[PDB]
Design a protein around this ligand. Structure first.
Ligand SMILES: [Mg+2]
Ligand SMILES: [Zn+2]
Lengths: 717, 1316
RNA sequence: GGAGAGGUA
């Protein structure tokens, strides 16, 4: 009765059923504000029944609870306005079943609807990871006053815009609005109403509505930027820019304090996300949310206007594909012949076959991509030109709305090679695309692969749930409970290097974490920052322009707080732009952040420097060989390429006993091989010149005279 | 070539491969299994007879007497199918067996008959199989899927270095009987050999070897070779076999014939053996050191002392050789061993063997099998013998023996059903050989190793195991004396067998409910092939290997159809053309390929046989002669594809569509979509709700009629004839003259199942699809069932679609729908709910259903009748009263909240011996009248048919048409006629007429008996009343409809038509999808479907326009002919000229709503032919047309794709889900809200949500939610009061469930409590 | 109330 899921602990004592609840399917209803959600009349009426009784008795329409129950039972017309009155400012909670992270449940204001489906503001769908393929949601209501205030002040949708896992926003215009905007901020080389001049975005809108100009054509227009470089003072400044009418129309929406350049590109998804991030970082919260609402409205309107449909004609197959494939096949034939005569072995035949197939597939992919993306050739009022294409598929792909290059490659080009169950790769690839029909065997193989994928997904989510459950259990007791523990130990955060380039610059590893010891600029003895300041963006910029290498930062692993951690040792909230507050349960949110993404994971010679700069070497225990080069005898020897300024730029592990052309502190040229070594055998490298004597080596019991017979040189083992 | 009925609507067809074999009868695999289960087989090797002959006879222990089997029989079913459905009892048959007790004479010698008696003892009732195959247990028709269990026999398996971390594989072998104890042999990491029985403790194998009365030397002789040394004048001149010299190194000087063949330190080259065999030398002088560490084969003893010098299996040493030499031993036999050829695996195990003799080995075996129980010299031997060699407790079926002999390269495919010494010896030999490298491990996922098993075998096994109990009972009875007066009735008991079979059928992990909201649902469900169940692996402990598609599934198991989620690769569906092997494997047809000609003759190949030959695939371009235009032909040789010569092939596929299931066979343009999305489309296709009136799909795959007719819904004529009279309820056909049998002419008649609830609360009924005087042909459709149209499947509706975003209303997958879809009302769906009410018998007396109840206004009572039962046809609403029931001291049933509808059927049942109220008597009388009138009409119709026949036979040889009508039919049979067989026929027909009279006269009484009788019931229940509500769910935003390409969506809004986009021509579209869906999830099939359907609709519209203004057939014939033309060498080749010039008119009428088009899945219509067909219409070949906005009215730039798509409305209704609860009931042991919509339960605030609330700073809300809103009684009572009093505050208290936990813990010896 | 089967996200 206690063990297992059915045990009281995990069944009735930790998770319970609850009154005052509802369940329904969800729809979009895009006309809503970001802070409110639709709600059926019936569910609304069912939930708030006690409040309805109270209001009825206050109005005196029912001097009892039984007559009141009767009245609500037959829902006289009065009851509906009473409901509307009660709902006025009463939030509710929406939840989706697999709630991984903190955002999986959120508060909302209700708006009554004559349906039976919970409308939902579309932007939050990304947060809920909620498709409209029939996903259901559950509704709760906060009864007591304190619950209502908690909801309004903490769980209101408008308060959760940055993922706790990282400062990245979480309200990115997901898939459709993004398409609309990208289509808006484009430019045909020669469209209706080109070259003219406008006296402001309003004229652009009027012109487009009258239809006298295309939605995107190059025009010079005067505008006014608002730069608040002064101390919270929005200085206006006018100019006469040259953009496309669509961009000008879009500019009407953006709030005051932003540079017009931010609205001057093709506006891919990344651009929109960055734009929102900057807008929040500058003009606080409310302008950002209202701007997002306007963004969504405009995006939907103009996406619908575009009428961007998909047709079979859009899948343009490259003309040269057949030739390429035929050539590859003929190539395969000769290799098969070489193996028929036995001149080559089977494994090498197999490997070369795979290699040439990959090469041909890559060629086909490149050819189709090129033939597609720039297909559009249009006279410019001169003779002829070309531009990026308006093929609906390419617009959808490049815009980032849906699908990477892989899917379009499969659609148009051959869909590569398929791997059989044991991980082996079939020698013959699938040479057919989906615009054409696959034959039996090809489809069979693809089906095998797809089933593998599906089964992997199922088992992966199953295990990930258990992992995260374990994770939260171990770190649920930890709560920040102090302001400062008063220490000086920390850790040297440095940009990550993987032999190759900077995998992650330092600026993002230390962003928003108080320092332990003040950094000194490379004007050494130059106190660049205090030792206990928060590294918000401006100071990060200071560091970057000073090219700092590593920083002593206060971690959490060493905080001297008992049964908790002082605020400074932790750092910024990362859920809002300021230090953590006192009391937060950081452990739980950290566990959730770590566990949520688990589902997306998968379950199952010589040194060639490439830059001109100074060479430096660390852990060097080396000698000069006969050729004058340098031979190393330490293992963890490390080679750095530093730039002229003196900041490390590249790093590589030096294998033991490797020959090196340079010494230390020389100058290298881009593409200069600097080191070499044998990766196979282990020598007995010496240090100094002289005779070698076979001391304590007698043939018969210590050594054997296994002299080489192929060549005839002395050899004893 | 085209049937008259077929000419109503003939689907234009694409595809070029000439079909060579029509699809077989889909429901074959079921009726045959059950058919074989129950039959009188003289061979006694099928079903009941085999079991009876096996268990019987039975001999007493003495045995002074025995009881033997003779024969059996099945009585008539007591009730018909419909009656069993109505009451809700099983549709079974009595079983009656004639058993024969014999008695010998005790004092007389063994074998004599003192006396003998016999009788036909009843035993058990066996449920029967309906015509369709389904069973009826309690009017709850279910279905039994087939299992896919690994076959009995032997298997050499290997663990692939997954244990001991040593990288060393460990080959094991398993023997699995069909009924008995398993057996396993395993290789220790230390090269030992271990027997294991039924997963019990491990054991050295040589023990069980000794169990067969096998000694050391016998075993060694069996398992190794000899090397003979000769003590001679000069130090062991040993005989040698040159063949033993591969893979060694000369350690000394090997010299003979005065020739140093090789020296020490040299490896034994092949040429060394060449020179050796050339010199033909046999004996080599060998140094004594060669025998340093050898082992003796047998024991050697001193002849004089009789004392063993060296017992067998003993190492070799110099002094031992001296003892042999003084003992005069000349021949010294030792074991020929090796490290790569012959490891001494037996010797090690023998050294491990603690036992040496038979008795001790058996004793320790007994101890292992049964811990404790100090054995006896007889217990172990009895145990072992009855265990592994008594047929009654151990059995390899014929399949097992065949497979076993097969694996061991034997010749006989038949043998005994038990084991033998040689069997085990050969098994172990083969295992050792595999260890040495020869022979290879055998996989498990090979289709050649797993076997299907249908119902019959399982039922037979259950019958046998039930029989065993009564067998034991009778045996213990006969062991007792007092046999002079026994009978074969008292010792036999029916209850054990009845229980044994009933429990299995009614309640088993394989007899499951039937999904019935489609014909397709029923079909695909019946063909299911599960891998779970008894003897099958478990859902939640399956690795990837099982779920993965083995290469052998090709053509035998549909790979693309599977229920995703918790169980994939386990619920596999059968492929279309698959058959079942005689044994139970899966066979598939293949066209025999001769030298260079593709014959039409076919052979059904099993999985194993396929691995040998070479098979070219279906779409290989031959030209009228099986001469492949190509030379490097693609063929699956053996678990892989390749390109082979034009002559080496041996077989060709039958049809492109032999790889898929029937379920996936219906998706057009399948060859373009992704795999998983096609799977999703299929699974959703399985869940379509029948609409109000079906509509053919404009673009079928041609598999529609097969599925429709093969399913049981539609009434298909059996013998062509003529409609003599039609009605909404029944049909009658005058049979064709020829199809008619010589005697008993009669005429065909059908009755139609009207509205009846399906398994999913969806009404089902049939409608005639013919008029009077319509000739019909054998096997043609007559009555359309649910979601069918003119005898072809039709699930959803085809509608005008356009691909574009629209104000975000189709943001993710939401589907925007215009208002015409609902106004024209082409998606409403009917549903039927059944509600029951009982009259228990409790203390304070029973309760009743009186029409009078307390504290209720007459308003509610207005709808009930005097009895207390609502009138039929009343239109009740949510929260009404259906039957008034009283509190014996108001339990009146009420309509569930929210549900509206109309009452259509009431029924009542009473315990026998109880008076019946007014309404019950009324209904009884009404049924009486109904049955009487029904049978009267039937009888007179049949008599009319008979007299029509009698008139027909008198039209020749004395026809007087006047005399026929002068005196009426009453006196016709007696008329004179020339003397011939005609008089015999007249007598025959008159006899049949009188027989019909008598049959009706008795059947009427039978039905009267069935009606008037009382009703059995469960104890306590006095009577039960059932009522049927009918509802029409129309549509709402929230519902879930979908297309066929796994492109599901939730309807979101109902715009008025005026806002919808409309073309320049004025037709507005009806659905707006989201283009963004396609690219990510690659399913172009929908786009191609849209184009093709648009073309078809254009053609239909052109025809309709031509018809609107009157146009003579001259134009119609031309245009239709040309339309049916324009195929790329299609095989349709339909000719219009041959038509009656009025069937032309009717066909045009049937086509004015489009021209149906067919598309085989992998023989689809490419782009060019679609383009040409479109251009036949005046539509833009590009497919995309310009549009105009409803609101603004302005044109959309960027021409848009529009067309027509076939879409289904799935069975997930928004009304079924939307649910709420403010404050309701409470669980009993724990005081929390109940769960589930059935009860008025509430939602479950799960653990993860608690975590999430913790992540926010929200604390109060969590506390309240899990303290006062759920658990703390006083807290919620006072909270209710506070809320009523407009004061939002709460008092936490303590959860009750915590006190529950506290008491529970304290129930254990743990003292737990709260401090201060 | 508990078991088992099936099904949806
Ligand atoms: Mg979903
Ligand atoms: Zn600290």
């Amino acid at each position: 009765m206690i063990k297992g899921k059915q045990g009281r602990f995990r069944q009735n004592l930790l998770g319970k059923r609850v009154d005052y609840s509802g369940r329904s399917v969800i729809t979009v209803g895009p006309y809503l504000r970001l802070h409110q959600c639709g709600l059926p009349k019936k569910m609304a009426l069912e939930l708030f029944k006690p409040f309805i009784y109270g209001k009825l008795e206050l109005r005196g329409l029912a001097t009892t609870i039984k007559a009141a129950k009767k009245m609500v039972e037959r829902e006289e017309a009065v009851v509906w306005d009473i409901l509307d009155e009660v709902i006025r400012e009463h939030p509710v909670l929406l939840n989706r079943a697999p709630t991984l992270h903190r955002l999986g449940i959120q508060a909302f204001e209700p708006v009554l609807i004559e349906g039976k489906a919970i409308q939902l503001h579309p932007l939050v769908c990304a947060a809920y990871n909620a498709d409209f393929d029939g996903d259901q949601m559950a509704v709760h209501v906060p009864l007591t006053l304190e619950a209502q205030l908690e909801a309004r002040a903490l769980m209101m949708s408008t308060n959760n815009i940055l993922s706790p896992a990282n400062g990245e926003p979480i309200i990115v215009p997901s898939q459709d609005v993004v398409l609309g905007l990208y289509y808006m901020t484009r430019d045909c080389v020669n469209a209706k109403g080109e070259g003219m001049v406008l006296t402001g975005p309003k004229e652009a809108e009027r012109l487009y509505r009258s239809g006298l100009a295309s939605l995107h054509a190059r025009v010079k227009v005067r505008i006014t930027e608002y730069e608040k470089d002064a101390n919270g003072e929005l200085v206006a400044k006018t100019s006469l820019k040259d953009t496309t009418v669509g961009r000008a129309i879009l500019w009407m929406i953006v709030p005051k304090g932003l540079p017009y350049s931010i609205v001057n590109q093709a506006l891919g998804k990344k651009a929109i996300s960055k734009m929102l991030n900057t807008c929040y970082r500058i003009l606080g919260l409310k302008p950002t949310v209202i701007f997002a609402d306007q963004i969504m409205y405009t995006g939907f309107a103009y996406a619908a206007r575009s009428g961007a449909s998909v047709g079979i004609d859009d899948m343009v197959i490259p003309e040269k594909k057949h030739e390429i494939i035929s050539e590859a096949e003929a190539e395969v034939a000769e290799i098969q012949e070489q193996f028929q005569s036995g001149l080559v072995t089977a494994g090498e035949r197999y490997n070369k076959v795979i290699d040439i197939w990959a090469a041909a597939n890559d060629r086909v992919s490149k050819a189709m991509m090129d033939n597609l993306q720039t297909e559009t050739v249009i006279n410019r009022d001169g003779q002829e030109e070309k531009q990026v294409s308006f093929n609906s598929i390419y617009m959808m792909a490049d815009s980032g709305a849906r699908g990477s290059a892989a899917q379009i490659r499969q659609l148009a080009g051959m869909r590569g090679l398929m791997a059989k169950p044991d991980g082996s790769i079939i020698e013959t690839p699938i040479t057919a695309n989906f615009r054409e029909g696959l034959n039996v065997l090809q489809y069979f193989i693809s089906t095998h692969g797809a089933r593998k994928g599906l089964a992997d997904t199922a088992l992966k989510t199953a295990n990930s749930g258990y992992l995260t459950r374990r994770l939260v259990d171990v770190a649920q007791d930890l709560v920040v409970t102090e302001d400062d523990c008063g220490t000086h130990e920390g850790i040297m955060m440095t940009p990550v290097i993987e032999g190759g380039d900077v995998k992650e610059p330092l600026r993002d590893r230390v962003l928003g974490r108080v320092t332990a010891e003040d950094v000194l600029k490379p004007g050494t003895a130059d106190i660049l920052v205090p030792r206990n300041t928060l590294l918000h963006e401006q100071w990060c910029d200071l560091l970057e322009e000073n090219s700092v290498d590593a920083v002593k930062v206060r971690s959490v692993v060493s905080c001297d707080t008992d049964f908790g951690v002082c605020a400074h040792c932790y750092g910024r909230d990362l859920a809002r732009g300021h230090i953590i507050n006192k009391g937060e349960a950081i452990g739980v949110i950290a566990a959730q952040s770590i566990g949520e993404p688990g589902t997306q994971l998968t379950m199952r010679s010589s040194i060639q420097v490439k830059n001109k700069g100074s060479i430096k070497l660390s852990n060097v225990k080396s000698v000069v060989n006969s050729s004058g080069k340098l031979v190393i005898t330490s293992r963890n020897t490390e080679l750095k390429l530093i730039d002229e300024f003196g900041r490390t730029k590249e790093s590589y592990k030096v294998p033991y006993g490797a020959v090196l052309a340079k010494g230390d502190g020389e100058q290298v040229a881009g593409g200069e091989t600097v080191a070499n070594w044998d990766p196979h055998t282990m020598p007995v490298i010496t240090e100094v010149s002289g005779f070698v004597r076979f001391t304590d080596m007698i043939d018969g019991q210590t050594i054997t005279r296994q002299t080489d017979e192929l060549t005839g040189l002395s050899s004893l083992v | 070539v085209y049937s008259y009925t077929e000419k109503k609507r003939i689907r234009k067809d694409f595809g070029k491969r000439p079909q060579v074999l029509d699809v077989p009868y889909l429901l074959s695999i079921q009726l045959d299994s059950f058919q074989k289960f129950i039959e009188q087989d003289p061979e006694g090797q099928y079903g009941l007879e085999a079991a009876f002959r096996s268990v019987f006879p039975i001999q007493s222990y003495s045995g002074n007497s025995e009881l033997q089997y003779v024969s059996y029989r099945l009585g008539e079913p007591v009730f018909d199918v419909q009656e069993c459905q109505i009451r809700g009892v099983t549709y079974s048959a009595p079983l009656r067996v004639k058993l024969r007790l014999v008695i010998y004479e005790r004092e007389a010698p063994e074998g004599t008959v003192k006396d003998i008696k016999e009788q036909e003892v009843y035993m058990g009732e066996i449920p029967l199989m309906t015509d369709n195959g389904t069973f009826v247990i309690n009017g709850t028709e279910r279905v039994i899927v087939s299992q896919l269990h690994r076959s009995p026999g032997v298997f050499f398996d290997s663990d692939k270095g997954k244990t001991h971390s040593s990288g060393k594989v460990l080959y094991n072998a398993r023997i699995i009987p069909y009924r008995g104890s398993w057996l396993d042999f395993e290789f220790d990491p230390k090269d030992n050999l271990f027997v294991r029985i039924d997963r019990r403790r491990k054991l050295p194998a040589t023990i069980i070897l000794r169990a067969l009365n096998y000694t050391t030397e016998q075993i060694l002789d069996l398992f190794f070779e000899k090397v003979i040394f000769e003590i001679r004048d000069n130090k062991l001149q040993m005989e040698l076999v040159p063949e033993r010299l591969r893979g060694e190194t000369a350690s000394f000087d090997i010299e003979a014939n005065g020739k140093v063949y090789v020296e020490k330190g040299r490896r034994i080259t092949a040429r060394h053996i060449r020179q050796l065999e050339k010199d033909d030398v046999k004996l080599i002088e060998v140094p004594v050191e060669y025998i340093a560490g050898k082992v003796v084969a047998k024991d050697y003893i001193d002849e004089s002392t009789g004392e063993l010098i060296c017992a067998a299996n003993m190492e070799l040493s110099l002094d031992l050789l001296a003892k042999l030499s003084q003992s005069g031993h000349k021949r010294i036999e030792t074991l020929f061993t090796n490290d790569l050829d012959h490891g001494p695996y037996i010797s090690e195990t023998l050294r491990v063997d603690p036992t040496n003799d038979r008795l001790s080995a058996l004793v320790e075996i007994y101890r292992m099998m049964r811990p404790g129980e100090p054995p006896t010299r007889e217990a172990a031997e009895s145990l072992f013998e009855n265990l592994f060699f008594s047929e009654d407790r151990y059995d390899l079926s014929a399949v097992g023996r065949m497979k076993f002999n097969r694996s061991l390269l034997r010749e006989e495919i038949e043998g005994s059903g038990i084991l033998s010494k040689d069997d085990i010896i050969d098994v172990m030999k083969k295992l050792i050989d595999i260890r040495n490298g020869k022979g290879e491990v055998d996989d498990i996922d090979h289709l050649g190793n797993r076997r299907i098993r249908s119902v019959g075998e399982m039922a037979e096994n259950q019958f046998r195991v039930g029989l065993v109990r009564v067998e034991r009972a009778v045996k213990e009875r006969l062991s007792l004396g007092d046999l002079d007066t026994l009978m074969p009735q008292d010792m036999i008991n029916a209850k054990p067998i009845s229980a044994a079979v009933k429990e299995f059928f009614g309640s088993s992990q394989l007899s499951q409910f039937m999904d019935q909201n489609n014909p397709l649902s029923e079909i695909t469900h019946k063909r299911r092939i599960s891998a779970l169940g008894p003897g099958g692996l478990t859902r939640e402990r399956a690795g990837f290997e099982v779920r993965d598609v083995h290469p052998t599934h090709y053509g035998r198991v549909c790979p693309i159809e599977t229920p995703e989620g918790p169980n994939i690769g386990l619920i596999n569906s059968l492929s279309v053309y698959a058959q079942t092997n005689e044994y139970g494997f899966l066979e598939t047809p293949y066209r025999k390929v001769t030298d260079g000609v593709v014959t039409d003759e076919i052979h059904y190949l099993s999985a194993i046989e396929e691995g040998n030959y070479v098979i070219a695939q279906a779409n290989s371009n031959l030209d009228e002669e099986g001469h492949f235009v190509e030379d490097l032909v693609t063929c699956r040789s053996k678990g892989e594809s390749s390109l082979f010569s034009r002559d080496q092939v041996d077989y060709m596929d039958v049809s492109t569509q032999q790889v898929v299931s029937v379920g996936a066979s219906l998706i057009p343009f399948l060859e373009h979509d992704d795999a998983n999305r096609a799977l999703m489309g299929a699974n959703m296709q399985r869940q379509a709700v029948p609409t109000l009136r079906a509509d053919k799909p404009l673009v079928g795959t041609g598999m529609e009629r097969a599925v429709a007719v093969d399913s049981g819904v539609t009434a298909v004529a059996k013998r062509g004839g003529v409609v003599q009279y039609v009605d909404a309820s029944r049909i009658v056909i005058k049979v064709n003259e020829d199809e008619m049998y010589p005697g008993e002419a009669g005429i065909d008649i059908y009755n139609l199942t009207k509205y009846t609830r399906s398994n999913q609360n969806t009404c089902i009924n049939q409608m005639p699809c013919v008029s009077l005087g319509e000739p019909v042909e054998r096997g043609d459709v007559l009555a359309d069932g649910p979601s069918t149209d003119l005898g072809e499947l039709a699930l959803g509706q085809n509608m005008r679609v356009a691909f574009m975003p629209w104000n975000g209303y189709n943001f993710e997958d939401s589907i925007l729908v215009s208002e015409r879809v609902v106004q024209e009302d082409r998606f409403t769906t009917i549903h039927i709910q059944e509600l029951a009410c009982v009259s228990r018998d409790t203390k304070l007396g029973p309760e009743e259903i009186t029409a009078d109840i307390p504290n209720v206004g007459e308003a509610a009572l207005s709808k009930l009748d005097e009895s207390g039962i609502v009138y039929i046809g009343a239109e009740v609403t949510g929260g009404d009263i259906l039957v008034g029931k009283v509190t014996p001291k108001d339990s009146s049933l009420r309509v569930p909240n929210g549900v509206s509808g109309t009452v259509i059927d009431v029924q009542v049942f009473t315990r026998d011996g109880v008076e019946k109220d007014k309404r019950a008597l009324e209904i009884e009388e009404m049924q009486l009248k109904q049955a009487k009138k029904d049978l009267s009409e039937e009888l007179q119709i049949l008599e009319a048919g008979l007299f029509s026949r009698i008139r027909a036979v008198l039209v020749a040889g004395g026809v007087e048409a006047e005399k026929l009508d002068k005196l009426p039919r009453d006196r016709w049979l007696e008329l004179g006629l020339t003397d011939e067989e005609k008089q015999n026929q007249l007598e025959q027909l008159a006899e049949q007429y009188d027989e019909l009279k008598h049959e009706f006269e008795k059947k009427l009484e039978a039905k009267r008996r069935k009606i008037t009788q009382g009703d059995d019931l469960a104890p306590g229940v006095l009577k039960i009343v059932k009522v049927y509500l009918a509802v029409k769910r129309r549509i709402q935003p929230g519902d879930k409809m979908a297309g066929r390409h796994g492109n599901k969506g939730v309807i979101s809004k109902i715009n008025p038509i005026e806002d919808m986009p409309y073309d320049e021509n004025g037709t507005p579209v009806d659905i707006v999808l989201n283009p963004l869906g396609v690219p990510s999830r690659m399913n172009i099939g929908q786009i191609l479907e849209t184009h093709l359907g648009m073309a078809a609709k254009g053609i239909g519209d052109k025809i309709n326009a031509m018809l609107k203004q009157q146009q003579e057939v001259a134009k119609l014939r031309e245009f239709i002919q040309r339309a049916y033309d324009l195929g790329a060498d299609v095989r349709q080749k339909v000719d219009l000229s041959t038509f009656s010039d009025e069937e032309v008119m009717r066909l045009a009428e049937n086509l004015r709503k489009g021209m149906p088009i067919a598309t085989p899945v992998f023989d689809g219509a490419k782009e060019a032919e679609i383009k040409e067909l479109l251009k036949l219409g005046d539509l833009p070949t590009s497919g995309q047309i310009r549009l105009y906005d409803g609101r603004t009215g302005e044109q959309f730039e960027r021409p848009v794709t529009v067309g027509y798509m076939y879409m289904l409305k799935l069975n997930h209704l928004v009304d079924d889900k939307m649910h709420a609860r403010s404050t309701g009931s409470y669980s009993l042991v724990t005081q929390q809200p109940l769960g589930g919509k059935a009860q008025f339960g509430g939602q479950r605030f799960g653990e993860m949500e608690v975590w999430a609330l913790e992540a926010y700073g929200a604390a109060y809300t969590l506390q309240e939610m899990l303290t006062v809103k759920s658990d703390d009684v006083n807290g919620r009572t006072k909270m209710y009061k506070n809320i009523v009093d407009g004061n939002h505050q709460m008092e936490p208290g303590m959860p009750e469930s915590f006190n529950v936990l506290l008491k529970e813990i304290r129930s254990l010896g743990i003292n737990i409590e709260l401090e201060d």
